[PDB]
Amino acid sequence: IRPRSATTVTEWDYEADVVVAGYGIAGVAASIEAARAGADVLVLERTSGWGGATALAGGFIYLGGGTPLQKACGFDDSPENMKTFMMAALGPGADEEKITDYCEGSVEHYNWLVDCGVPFKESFWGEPGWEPPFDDGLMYSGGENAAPFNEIAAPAPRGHVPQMDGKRTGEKGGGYMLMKPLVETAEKLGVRAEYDMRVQTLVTDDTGRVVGIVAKQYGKEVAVRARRGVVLATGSFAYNDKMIEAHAPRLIGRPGAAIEEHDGRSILMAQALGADLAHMDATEVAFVCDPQLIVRGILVNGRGQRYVPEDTYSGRIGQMTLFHQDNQAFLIIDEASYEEGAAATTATPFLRVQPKWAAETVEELESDMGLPAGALQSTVEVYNKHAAEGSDPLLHKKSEWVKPIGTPVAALDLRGFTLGFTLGGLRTTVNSEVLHVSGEPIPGLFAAGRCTSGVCAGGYASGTSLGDGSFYGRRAGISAAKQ
Amino acid sequence: IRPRSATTVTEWDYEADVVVAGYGIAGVAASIEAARAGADVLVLERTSGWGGATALAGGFIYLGGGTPLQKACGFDDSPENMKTFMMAALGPGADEEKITDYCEGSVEHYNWLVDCGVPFKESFWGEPGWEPPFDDGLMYSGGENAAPFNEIAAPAPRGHVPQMDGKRTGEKGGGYMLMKPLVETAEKLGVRAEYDMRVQTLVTDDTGRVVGIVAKQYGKEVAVRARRGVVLATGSFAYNDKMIEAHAPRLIGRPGAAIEEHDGRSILMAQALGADLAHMDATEVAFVCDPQLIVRGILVNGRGQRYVPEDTYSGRIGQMTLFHQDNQAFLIIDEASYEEGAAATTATPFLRVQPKWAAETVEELESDMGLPAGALQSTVEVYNKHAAEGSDPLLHKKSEWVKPIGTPVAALDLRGFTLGFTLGGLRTTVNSEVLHVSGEPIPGLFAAGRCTSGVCAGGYASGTSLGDGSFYGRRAGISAAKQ
Ligand SMILES: Cc1cc2nc3c(=O)[nH]c(=O)nc-3n(C[C@H](O)[C@H](O)[C@H](O)COP(=O)(O)OP(=O)(O)OC[C@H]3O[C@@H](n4cnc5c(N)ncnc54)[C@H](O)[C@@H]3O)c2cc1C
Numbered sequence: 001i002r003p004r005s006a007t008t009v010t011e012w013d014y015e016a017d018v019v020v021a022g023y024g025i026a027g028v029a030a031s032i033e034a035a036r037a038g039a040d041v042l043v044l045e046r047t048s049g050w051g052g053a054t055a056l057a058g059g060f061i062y063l064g065g066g067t068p069l070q071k072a073c074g075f076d077d078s079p080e081n082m083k084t085f086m087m088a089a090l091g092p093g094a095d096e097e098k099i100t101d102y103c104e105g106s107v108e109h110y111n112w113l114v115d116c117g118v119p120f121k122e123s124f125w126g127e128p129g130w131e132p133p134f135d136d137g138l139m140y141s142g143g144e145n146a147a148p149f150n151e152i153a154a155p156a157p158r159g160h161v162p163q164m165d166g167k168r169t170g171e172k173g174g175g176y177m178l179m180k181p182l183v184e185t186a187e188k189l190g191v192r193a194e195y196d197m198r199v200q201t202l203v204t205d206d207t208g209r210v211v212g213i214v215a216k217q218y219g220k221e222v223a224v225r226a227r228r229g230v231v232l233a234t235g236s237f238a239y240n241d242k243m244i245e246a247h248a249p250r251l252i253g254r255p256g257a258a259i260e261e262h263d264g265r266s267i268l269m270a271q272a273l274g275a276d277l278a279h280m281d282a283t284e285v286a287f288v289c290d291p292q293l294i295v296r297g298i299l300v301n302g303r304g305q306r307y308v309p310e311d312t313y314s315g316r317i318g319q320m321t322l323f324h325q326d327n328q329a330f331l332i333i334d335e336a337s338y339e340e341g342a343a344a345t346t347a348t349p350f351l352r353v354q355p356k357w358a359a360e361t362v363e364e365l366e367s368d369m370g371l372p373a374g375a376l377q378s379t380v381e382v383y384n385k386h387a388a389e390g391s392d393p394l395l396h397k398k399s400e401w402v403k404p405i406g407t408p409v410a411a412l413d414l415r416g417f418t419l420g421f422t423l424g425g426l427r428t429t430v431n432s433e434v435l436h437v438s439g440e441p442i443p444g445l446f447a448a449g450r451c452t453s454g455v456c457a458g459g460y461a462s463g464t465s466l467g468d469g470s471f472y473g474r475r476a477g478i479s480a481a482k483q
Numbered sequence: 484i485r486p487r488s489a490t491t492v493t494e495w496d497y498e499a500d501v502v503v504a505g506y507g508i509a510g511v512a513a514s515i516e517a518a519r520a521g522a523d524v525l526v527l528e529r530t531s532g533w534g535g536a537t538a539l540a541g542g543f544i545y546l547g548g549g550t551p552l553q554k555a556c557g558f559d560d561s562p563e564n565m566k567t568f569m570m571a572a573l574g575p576g577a578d579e580e581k582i583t584d585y586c587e588g589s590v591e592h593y594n595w596l597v598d599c600g601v602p603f604k605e606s607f608w609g610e611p612g613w614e615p616p617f618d619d620g621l622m623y624s625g626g627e628n629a630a631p632f633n634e635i636a637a638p639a640p641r642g643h644v645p646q647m648d649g650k651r652t653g654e655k656g657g658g659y660m661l662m663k664p665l666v667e668t669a670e671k672l673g674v675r676a677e678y679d680m681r682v683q684t685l686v687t688d689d690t691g692r693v694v695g696i697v698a699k700q701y702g703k704e705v706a707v708r709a710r711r712g713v714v715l716a717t718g719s720f721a722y723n724d725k726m727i728e729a730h731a732p733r734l735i736g737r738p739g740a741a742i743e744e745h746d747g748r749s750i751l752m753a754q755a756l757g758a759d760l761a762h763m764d765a766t767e768v769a770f771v772c773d774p775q776l777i778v779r780g781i782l783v784n785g786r787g788q789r790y791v792p793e794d795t796y797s798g799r800i801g802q803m804t805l806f807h808q809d810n811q812a813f814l815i816i817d818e819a820s821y822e823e824g825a826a827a828t829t830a831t832p833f834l835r836v837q838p839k840w841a842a843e844t845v846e847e848l849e850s851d852m853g854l855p856a857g858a859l860q861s862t863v864e865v866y867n868k869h870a871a872e873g874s875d876p877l878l879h880k881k882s883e884w885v886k887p888i889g890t891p892v893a894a895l896d897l898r899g900f901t902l903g904f905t906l907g908g909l910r911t912t913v914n915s916e917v918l919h920v921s922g923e924p925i926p927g928l929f930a931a932g933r934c935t936s937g938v939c940a941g942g943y944a945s946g947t948s949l950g951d952g953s954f955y956g957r958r959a960g961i962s963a964a965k966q
C-alpha cells in the first residue's frame with residue numbers, strides 16, 4: 001500500500017494522460033470530461049465489465065433547483081431551497097461549500113446528463129415507495145415532504161430517475177440507464193478501458209506528485225503511467241470488515257453495498273500519501289419493509305414508543321431505527337390498514353412483511369409482544385386521541401396519513417431490518433482534488449464517488465450517491481486533464 | 484505538517500534516545516518506563532509546565548480484575564468480568580485485543596501506580612455523583628451497577644481515585660495526585676524536560692523511520708533527535724474546529740476538553756506518514772446536572788418519553804441524550820424528591836439545576852412545557868403503575884430508586900446540557916506502536932493517550948482516559964526504549 005517511487009518502475013505497461021481507477025458512475029463521468037478536454041484517457045476496471053454498483057442501483061440521481069423535469073411535473077425549486085434542505089438533512093457537519101456548489105450547478109448537471117443521452121420521463125410518482133413502480137422520472141427521495149424538513153425548506157421532489165422498462169434493482173436497475181448512455185458517450189470520445197485491473201498502489205515522483213499506479217491485471221503486476229492525473233473512482237469500503245469495525249461499526253454484520261469490490265483500497269492508497277478523510281462513520285441505512293405498509297401504521301421502538309413520522313423517507317426510518325432505537329422496531333397496524341397497504345402499488349412487493357402477532361385488542365397485542373402493561377396501550381391511546389382530529393403533534397406525520405388505529409390490530413416484527421453502505425472517505429475539494437492533511441491538494445491525485453466524502457456527512461437522501469459521483473466525477477476529469 | 488527529511492536537518496538543537504511529546508499522563512508514564520529501561524529521555528511540553536488535562540481531571544483511573552483497593556472495599560472482580568463489561572459498554576466495535584490486554588494487566592498496573600507513590604484511600608463512595616465528595620478511593624464510574632450492563636457482567640466498581648484533599652476539577656483535580664508522584668518518579672530517574680515546545684512535524688530518514696521532531700520553542704524553530712523513538716502524547720483534537728466538523732460533528736459548538744492545546748496536531752503529523760486512525764467519531768459526553776437530582780426523577784425526551792434508566796453513569800445519560808434524543812431532555816421530579824436530592828451529599832453542588840416549571844398536576848405541567856395532551860401524562864401514569872410495585876420494566880432503573888412520582892411536580896429544562904471531548908485517534912498496537920494503513924508499525928513512532936484510539940470505541944466510562952493513557956503510556960516507553 002506504500003507508494004512506489006517512479007524511479008523503481010523499469011517499464012510502463014500502459015500510459016495515458018488521465019488514468020481513471022473504477023468504471024462506475026464517478027469514473028465514466030470523469031472519463032467524458034477528460035476526453036472532451038483533449039486528454040488521452042484510460043479507465044482501469046477491476047471486474048470484467050463496466051457499471052459497478054451504479055448499474056445495479058434504483059437509478060435515483062439527486063437533482064433540483066428547477067430542472068426541466070421538476071418544471072414539467074409542476075414543482076417549484078431553487079438552488080437556495082435545495083441547499084437549505086440538504087444542509088439540514090445530510091448533516092450534522094455537512095460540507096457547506098460542497099453542498100452550495102452542488103446545488104448551484106444542479107440544473108446544468110441535469111441538462112448535461114440529458115445531453116449525454118440519459119432519458120427521463122416527464123412524470124412524477126407520488127406514493128410511498130423505494131422507487132417508481134413504473135418508468136416515471138421524478139419522485140420524493142429524501143423526506144423533503146415530511147417532518148422535520150417540510151418546515152425547514154419548501155418541499156420539492158429531487159429524485160430524478162432515468163427512464164427504463166423492467167428495472168431490477170440489484171441485477172440491472174434504473175442505474176443501468178444512467179451508466180449506458182454515459183459509456184456510449186465515453187466510447188465515442190475515444191476513452192480506452194482495461195479490464196481485470198485491480199489497482200493496488202500509487203506511484204509518486206521525488207516531489208510527491210502522483211504520476212501513475214501499480215495494479216494486478218490477468219494475474220501479474222503492471223504499472224500504468226498518468227502524465228496529467230490519476231482519478232480514484234473505485235467505490236466505498238462497505239466490504240472491508242476491518243475498516244467497518246474501525247470506522248463505521250454500526251454496520252458490523254449488516255453490510256448492504258451492491259458489490260464486493262467496495263473494499264476501501266483507494267482510500268488506503270491515498271492515506272499512505274497523507275490524504276485526509278472525513279465522516280468515516282457516516283452510513284446509508286435501508287429499512288427492508290414496504291413503505292406502503294409503514295405509512296399506514298405506527299412504528300414503535302422496543303419500549304412501545306413512537307419515534308419517527310411514518311411518512312418520511314424509508315432510509316431515514318432506517319437510520320433512526322439503527323442509530324437511535326438499538327435496531328428494534330415494530331409496525332403496529334390495524335387489519336383494514338394492513339390490507340389496504342398490502343394492495344397498494346409498489347416497486348417492492350417482496351418487502352410486504354407479514355404480521356408476527358395479531359390480536360383483538362391493543363392490550364392483548366401488548367402482552368403478546370412482551371411489552372410492559374400500558375407501554376403500548378398508552379402510545380396508542382395518545383396517538384388515537386389526536387388522530388381523531390387528524391393531528392400528529394408528537395412526530396408530525398402528515399394529516400392525510402393520520403387516523404385512529406382500530407381493531408383487530410397486528411404487529412410486524414421489524415427488529416434487525418436494517419443494512420447499509422458507507423458514506424465516508426477521502427476529503428476532496430469542489431474540483432475533486434484529494435486533500436492532504438496539510439490542507440493542500442496532493443499533486444496529480446483526484447477522486448470522486450464513494451471513495452470520497454461527498455454531499456452526505458451523516459443523513460442520507462436517495463440519489464445523492466449517483467448525484468455526487470456523477471457531478472464530482474465530471475470535476476475530477478476536468479481537473480485531471482489540466483496541464 | 485509534511486515530514487522533514489533528516490538530510491535537511493543541518494543541526495540538532497537537542498538529542499535523546501526517547502523523545503516524548505506532551506507531559507501529561509501518557510507522556511509521564513512513557514518517560515518512567517523508558518528511563519527505567521536505561522534510555523536517555525527528553526519530554527517536550529508545549530506549555531510552561533507539566534500536567535496537561537490530567538492535572539485538572541477528577542482523577543478517576545479505570546482499573547479492576549481484583550485490585551487491592553477493590554478487595555479492601557469488599558468487591559469481587561476478575562479480568563474476564565471486567566472485559567465482558569468493557570466490550571459491552573465501550574463499543575460498538577471495541578478493540579477486543581486491546582481491552583483484553585488492558586484487563587489482564589489491570590491489577591499489575593494498579594500496583595505499579597502505588598509503587599510510584601500514587602496514594603489511594605481504602606474506602607468506597609456509594610452515592611450517585613460525578614466524583615467522591617471526600618477523599619474516597621473507589622466508586623462506580625461506568626454504569627456497571629445499572630441496566631443494561633448489570634445483567635451482562637457482574638457489577639464491580641472500577642473508578643479508582645487518588646487520595647487528595649481540596650480537589651477542584653478544572654483547576655487542580657484528583658488527577659493532580661496521579662500526575663505529581665509520577666513526575667517525582669520521572670525526575671528521580673533523570674528524565675529531562677523542555678518547555679514552550681510546540682511540536683510541529685516528524686523527521687524521517689530515507690527508510691521512513693521517525694528519527695526526530697521539529698518544534699517551535701521560545702519563538703524559533705528547533706530540531707530534536709530521537710535515536711530510539713518518538714512517543715506522541717499530546718492529547719485530543721477537541722479544540723480543532725475543522726477536525727470536529729469533519730470527524731466528530733456531534734460536538735460542534737459543545738467543546739468540553741479541559742485544555743486548548745488539544746488541537747490534534749500529533750494525529751495530523753502521523754497521518755502525514757500514512758498512519759491509520761480509528762473511531763474518529765467517538766465522543767465522551769458529560770451531562771451538567773447533579774446526579775443526586777437525576778436519580779430521584781424521570782428523564783424524558785422532547786416527546787415526553789423516558790429513554791434511559793436514571794441511575795446509570797451520568798456520562799451515559801449524556802451520550803443517550805445528545806446522540807439519540809436530539810439533545811433534548813427534561814427531568815420530571817416531585818417536590819419532595821427534588822428537596823431530598825438537593826440536600827444529598829455531592830461533589831458538584833453547583834450542578835443543582837433549579838426547576839423551570841412547577842405545577843400542582845402532571846396535566847398542568849405537561850401543558851406548561853408545551854407537550855401534546857397526554858404525552859407526559861401517559862408516561863407518568865405507566866411509570867407510576869409499575870413503580871407502585873417497585874418495578875421499572877421499561878428501562879430497569881434499580882428498585883431502590885423506583886417509586887411513584889407524586890405532586891406537586893416540577894420539570895428541569897435540560898435541553899442543551901451536554902458537552903464533550905474526543906475519543907478517536909491514531910491506531911496503535913498493544914505495544915503502543917503507531918500503525919500505518921498497511922497494518923505495519925511505523926518504525927520509530929509510538930503513541931498513547933488521547934492522541935490515540937484507546938479502550939473506548941464509542942461508549943465511555945469515567946477513568947478510562949487516565950487508565951488507558953497511563954497503561955499504554957508505559958507500553959510506549961518500553962517499546963520506544965528498545966534498540
Ligand atoms: C440496493 C441499492 C440501491 C441503490 N440505489 C441507489 C440510487 O438509486 N441512487 C443513489 O444515489 N445511490 C444508490 N445506491 C448507491 C450507489 O449504487 C453507489 O453508492 C454508487 O453506485 C457508487 O458509485 P461509485 O462510482 O463510487 O462506485 P461504482 O459504481 O461501484 O464503481 C466503482 C468501480 O470501481 C471498481 N473497483 C473497485 N476496486 C477497484 C480497484 N482496486 N481497481 C480498479 N477498479 C476497482 C468496481 O468494480 C466498480 O466497477 C444504491 C445502493 C444499493 C445497495
Ligand SMILES: Cc1cc2nc3c(=O)[nH]c(=O)nc-3n(C[C@H](O)[C@H](O)[C@H](O)COP(=O)(O)OP(=O)(O)OC[C@H]3O[C@@H](n4cnc5c(N)ncnc54)[C@H](O)[C@@H]3O)c2cc1C
Binds near residue numbers: 680682931
Ligand atoms: C471535566 C473533566 C474531567 C475529567 N476527569 C477525568 C477522569 O476523572 N478520569 C479520566 O480518565 N479522564 C478524565 N477526563 C479526561 C482526561 O482529563 C483526559 O482525557 C486525559 O488527561 C488526556 O491525557 P493525555 O496524556 O492524552 O493528555 P494531557 O494530560 O492533556 O497531556 C497532553 C500534553 O501535551 C501537550 N501538548 C499539546 N500539544 C503539544 C505539542 N504540539 N507539542 C508538545 N506538547 C503538546 C499539552 O500541553 C499537555 O501537557 C476529564 C475531562 C474533563 C473535561
Ligand SMILES: [Cl-]
Binds near residue numbers: 053256257258259421
Ligand atoms: Cl452500493
Ligand SMILES: [Cl-]
Binds near residue numbers: 740904
Ligand atoms: Cl480533557
